[PDB]
Amino acid sequence: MQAITERLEAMLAQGTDNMLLRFTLGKTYAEHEQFDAALPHLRAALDFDPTYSVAWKWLGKTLQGQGDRAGARQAWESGLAAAQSRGDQQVVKELQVFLRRLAREDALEHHHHHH
């Protein structure tokens, strides 16, 4: 049937506890902007396999989508060095772009504006 989560539940109930299966289910929550529900699920995955670069990139989106500007800032700052340590320039730059855009809002309320 429809919904990736629903069909995955079948194989999860078969005792096939795999790495990517944790991530895919979490992505669906984040895509639906259900970052609140995503947080516990993604956190559970990071406990088992914290070396998944793509997950770091979603985590950053999680905090900003939740509505925590400070959390989003700290998240990208944390994941940046993680991506650096993994040598994944693509992820570093991807997260960096969002981190800049977030700063532009800080620039407004916290007057980090160029003027």
Coordinates of N, CA and C in Angstrom, one line a residue:
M1 N 0.8 -1.2 0.0 CA 0.0 0.0 0.0 C 0.9 1.2 0.0
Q2 N 0.2 2.4 0.0 CA 1.0 3.7 0.0 C 1.6 3.9 1.3
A3 N 2.5 5.0 1.4 CA 3.3 5.3 2.5 C 4.4 4.4 2.8
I4 N 5.6 4.9 2.6 CA 6.8 4.1 2.7 C 7.0 3.5 4.1
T5 N 6.6 4.3 5.1 CA 6.7 3.9 6.5 C 5.9 2.6 6.8
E6 N 4.6 2.6 6.3 CA 3.7 1.5 6.5 C 4.2 0.2 6.0
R7 N 4.7 0.2 4.8 CA 5.2 -1.0 4.1 C 6.5 -1.5 4.8
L8 N 7.3 -0.6 5.2 CA 8.6 -0.9 5.9 C 8.3 -1.6 7.2
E9 N 7.3 -1.2 7.9 CA 6.9 -1.8 9.2 C 6.8 -3.4 9.1
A10 N 6.4 -3.8 7.9 CA 6.3 -5.3 7.7 C 7.7 -6.0 7.8
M11 N 8.7 -5.4 7.2 CA 10.0 -6.0 7.2 C 10.7 -5.8 8.6
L12 N 10.4 -4.7 9.2 CA 10.9 -4.4 10.5 C 10.3 -5.4 11.6
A13 N 9.1 -5.8 11.3 CA 8.5 -6.8 12.2 C 9.0 -8.2 11.9
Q14 N 9.9 -8.4 10.9 CA 10.5 -9.6 10.6 C 11.9 -9.7 11.2
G15 N 12.2 -8.7 12.0 CA 13.5 -8.8 12.7 C 14.7 -8.4 11.9
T16 N 14.4 -7.6 10.8 CA 15.5 -7.1 10.0 C 15.9 -5.7 10.4
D17 N 16.6 -5.7 11.5 CA 17.1 -4.4 12.0 C 18.4 -4.0 11.3
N18 N 18.2 -3.2 10.3 CA 19.3 -2.7 9.5 C 19.6 -1.2 9.7
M19 N 20.7 -0.7 9.2 CA 21.1 0.7 9.4 C 20.2 1.6 8.6
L20 N 20.2 1.4 7.3 CA 19.5 2.3 6.4 C 18.0 2.4 6.7
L21 N 17.5 1.3 7.2 CA 16.0 1.2 7.5 C 15.7 2.2 8.6
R22 N 16.6 2.5 9.5 CA 16.4 3.5 10.5 C 16.3 4.9 9.9
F23 N 17.2 5.1 8.9 CA 17.3 6.4 8.3 C 16.1 6.7 7.4
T24 N 15.7 5.8 6.6 CA 14.7 6.0 5.6 C 13.4 6.4 6.3
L25 N 13.1 5.7 7.4 CA 11.9 6.0 8.2 C 11.9 7.4 8.8
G26 N 13.1 7.8 9.2 CA 13.3 9.1 9.8 C 13.2 10.2 8.7
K27 N 13.7 10.0 7.5 CA 13.6 11.0 6.4 C 12.1 11.3 6.1
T28 N 11.3 10.3 6.2 CA 9.8 10.6 5.9 C 9.2 11.6 6.8
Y29 N 9.6 11.5 8.1 CA 9.1 12.4 9.1 C 9.6 13.8 8.8
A30 N 10.8 13.9 8.4 CA 11.4 15.2 8.2 C 10.9 15.9 6.9
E31 N 10.6 15.0 5.9 CA 10.0 15.5 4.6 C 8.6 16.1 4.8
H32 N 7.9 15.5 5.8 CA 6.6 15.9 6.1 C 6.6 17.0 7.1
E33 N 7.7 17.5 7.4 CA 7.9 18.6 8.3 C 7.5 18.2 9.7
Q34 N 7.5 16.9 10.0 CA 7.2 16.4 11.3 C 8.5 16.2 12.1
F35 N 9.3 17.2 12.0 CA 10.6 17.2 12.7 C 10.6 16.8 14.2
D36 N 9.4 17.2 14.8 CA 9.2 16.9 16.2 C 9.3 15.3 16.4
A37 N 8.6 14.6 15.6 CA 8.5 13.2 15.6 C 9.8 12.6 15.1
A38 N 10.5 13.3 14.2 CA 11.7 12.9 13.6 C 12.9 12.8 14.6
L39 N 12.9 13.8 15.5 CA 13.9 14.0 16.5 C 14.3 12.7 17.3
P40 N 13.3 12.0 17.9 CA 13.5 10.7 18.7 C 14.0 9.6 17.7
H41 N 13.4 9.6 16.5 CA 13.7 8.5 15.6 C 15.1 8.7 15.0
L42 N 15.5 9.9 14.7 CA 16.8 10.2 14.1 C 17.9 10.0 15.2
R43 N 17.5 10.4 16.4 CA 18.4 10.3 17.6 C 18.8 8.8 17.9
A44 N 17.8 8.0 17.7 CA 17.9 6.6 17.9 C 18.9 6.0 16.9
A45 N 18.8 6.5 15.7 CA 19.7 6.0 14.6 C 21.1 6.5 14.9
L46 N 21.3 7.7 15.3 CA 22.6 8.3 15.5 C 23.3 7.6 16.7
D47 N 22.6 7.0 17.6 CA 23.2 6.3 18.7 C 23.9 5.0 18.2
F48 N 23.2 4.4 17.2 CA 23.8 3.2 16.6 C 24.9 3.5 15.6
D49 N 24.6 4.4 14.7 CA 25.5 4.8 13.6 C 25.5 6.3 13.4
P50 N 26.4 7.0 14.1 CA 26.5 8.5 14.1 C 27.3 9.0 12.9
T51 N 27.9 8.0 12.2 CA 28.8 8.4 11.1 C 28.0 8.6 9.7
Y52 N 26.7 8.7 9.8 CA 26.0 8.9 8.6 C 25.8 10.4 8.2
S53 N 26.7 10.9 7.3 CA 26.7 12.3 7.0 C 25.4 12.9 6.6
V54 N 24.6 12.2 5.8 CA 23.3 12.6 5.3 C 22.4 12.9 6.5
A55 N 22.5 12.1 7.5 CA 21.7 12.3 8.7 C 22.0 13.6 9.4
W56 N 23.3 14.0 9.5 CA 23.7 15.2 10.1 C 23.0 16.4 9.4
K57 N 22.9 16.3 8.1 CA 22.3 17.3 7.2 C 20.8 17.4 7.5
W58 N 20.2 16.3 7.8 CA 18.7 16.3 8.1 C 18.5 16.9 9.5
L59 N 19.4 16.5 10.4 CA 19.3 17.0 11.8 C 19.3 18.6 11.8
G60 N 20.2 19.2 11.0 CA 20.1 20.6 10.9 C 18.8 21.2 10.5
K61 N 18.2 20.5 9.5 CA 16.9 20.9 9.0 C 15.8 20.6 10.1
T62 N 16.1 19.7 11.0 CA 15.1 19.3 12.0 C 14.9 20.4 13.0
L63 N 16.0 21.0 13.5 CA 15.9 22.1 14.4 C 15.3 23.3 13.8
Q64 N 15.7 23.7 12.6 CA 15.1 24.9 12.0 C 13.6 24.7 11.7
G65 N 13.2 23.5 11.3 CA 11.8 23.2 11.0 C 11.0 23.2 12.3
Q66 N 11.6 22.7 13.4 CA 11.0 22.7 14.7 C 10.7 24.1 15.1
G67 N 11.6 25.0 14.8 CA 11.4 26.4 15.1 C 12.4 26.9 16.2
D68 N 13.6 26.2 16.2 CA 14.6 26.6 17.2 C 15.8 27.1 16.4
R69 N 15.9 28.5 16.3 CA 17.0 29.1 15.6 C 18.4 28.8 16.2
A70 N 18.4 28.8 17.6 CA 19.6 28.5 18.3 C 20.1 27.1 18.1
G71 N 19.1 26.2 18.2 CA 19.4 24.8 18.0 C 19.9 24.5 16.7
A72 N 19.3 25.1 15.7 CA 19.7 24.9 14.3 C 21.2 25.4 14.1
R73 N 21.5 26.5 14.6 CA 22.8 27.1 14.6 C 23.8 26.1 15.1
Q74 N 23.6 25.6 16.3 CA 24.5 24.7 17.0 C 24.6 23.4 16.3
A75 N 23.5 22.9 15.7 CA 23.4 21.7 15.0 C 24.4 21.7 13.7
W76 N 24.3 22.7 12.9 CA 25.1 22.8 11.7 C 26.6 23.0 12.1
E77 N 26.8 23.7 13.2 CA 28.2 23.9 13.7 C 28.8 22.6 14.1
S78 N 28.0 21.7 14.6 CA 28.4 20.4 15.1 C 28.6 19.5 13.9
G79 N 27.7 19.5 12.9 CA 27.8 18.6 11.8 C 28.9 19.0 10.8
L80 N 29.2 20.3 10.8 CA 30.2 20.8 9.9 C 31.5 20.0 10.1
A81 N 32.0 20.0 11.3 CA 33.3 19.4 11.7 C 33.1 17.9 11.5
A82 N 31.9 17.3 11.7 CA 31.7 15.9 11.5 C 32.0 15.6 10.0
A83 N 31.4 16.4 9.1 CA 31.6 16.3 7.7 C 33.1 16.5 7.3
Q84 N 33.7 17.5 7.9 CA 35.1 17.7 7.7 C 35.9 16.5 8.1
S85 N 35.6 15.9 9.2 CA 36.3 14.7 9.7 C 36.1 13.5 8.8
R86 N 35.0 13.5 8.1 CA 34.7 12.5 7.1 C 35.2 12.9 5.7
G87 N 35.7 14.1 5.6 CA 36.2 14.6 4.3 C 35.1 14.7 3.2
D88 N 33.9 15.0 3.6 CA 32.8 15.1 2.7 C 32.5 16.6 2.5
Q89 N 33.2 17.2 1.5 CA 33.1 18.6 1.2 C 31.7 19.0 0.7
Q90 N 31.1 18.1 0.0 CA 29.7 18.4 -0.5 C 28.8 18.7 0.7
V91 N 28.8 17.9 1.7 CA 27.9 18.0 2.9 C 28.3 19.3 3.7
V92 N 29.6 19.6 3.8 CA 30.1 20.7 4.5 C 29.5 22.0 3.8
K93 N 29.6 22.1 2.5 CA 29.1 23.3 1.8 C 27.6 23.3 1.8
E94 N 26.9 22.2 1.7 CA 25.4 22.1 1.7 C 24.9 22.7 3.0
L95 N 25.4 22.2 4.1 CA 25.0 22.7 5.4 C 25.5 24.1 5.7
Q96 N 26.6 24.5 5.1 CA 27.2 25.8 5.3 C 26.2 26.9 4.7
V97 N 25.6 26.6 3.5 CA 24.7 27.5 2.9 C 23.5 27.8 3.8
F98 N 22.9 26.8 4.3 CA 21.8 26.9 5.2 C 22.2 27.7 6.5
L99 N 23.4 27.4 7.0 CA 23.9 28.1 8.2 C 24.1 29.6 8.0
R100 N 24.4 30.0 6.7 CA 24.5 31.4 6.4 C 23.2 32.0 6.4
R101 N 22.2 31.4 5.7 CA 20.9 31.9 5.6 C 20.2 32.1 7.0
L102 N 20.5 31.2 7.9 CA 20.0 31.3 9.2 C 20.5 32.5 10.0
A103 N 21.8 32.8 9.7 CA 22.5 33.9 10.3 C 21.8 35.2 9.8
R104 N 21.3 35.2 8.6 CA 20.6 36.4 8.1 C 19.4 36.8 8.9
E105 N 18.8 35.9 9.5 CA 17.7 36.2 10.4 C 18.2 36.7 11.8
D106 N 19.3 36.2 12.2 CA 20.0 36.7 13.4 C 20.4 38.1 13.2
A107 N 20.8 38.4 11.9 CA 21.2 39.7 11.5 C 20.1 40.7 11.7
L108 N 18.9 40.3 11.7 CA 17.7 41.1 11.8 C 17.4 41.4 13.3
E109 N 17.2 40.4 14.1 CA 16.8 40.5 15.5 C 17.9 40.9 16.4
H110 N 19.1 40.4 16.1 CA 20.3 40.5 16.9 C 21.2 41.5 16.3
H111 N 20.7 42.1 15.2 CA 21.4 43.1 14.4 C 22.9 42.7 14.1
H112 N 23.0 41.6 13.4 CA 24.3 41.2 12.9 C 24.3 41.6 11.4
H113 N 23.4 42.5 11.1 CA 23.2 43.0 9.7 C 24.5 43.8 9.3
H114 N 24.8 43.8 8.0 CA 26.0 44.5 7.5 C 25.9 46.0 7.9
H115 N 24.7 46.5 8.1 CA 24.5 47.9 8.5 C 23.6 47.9 9.7

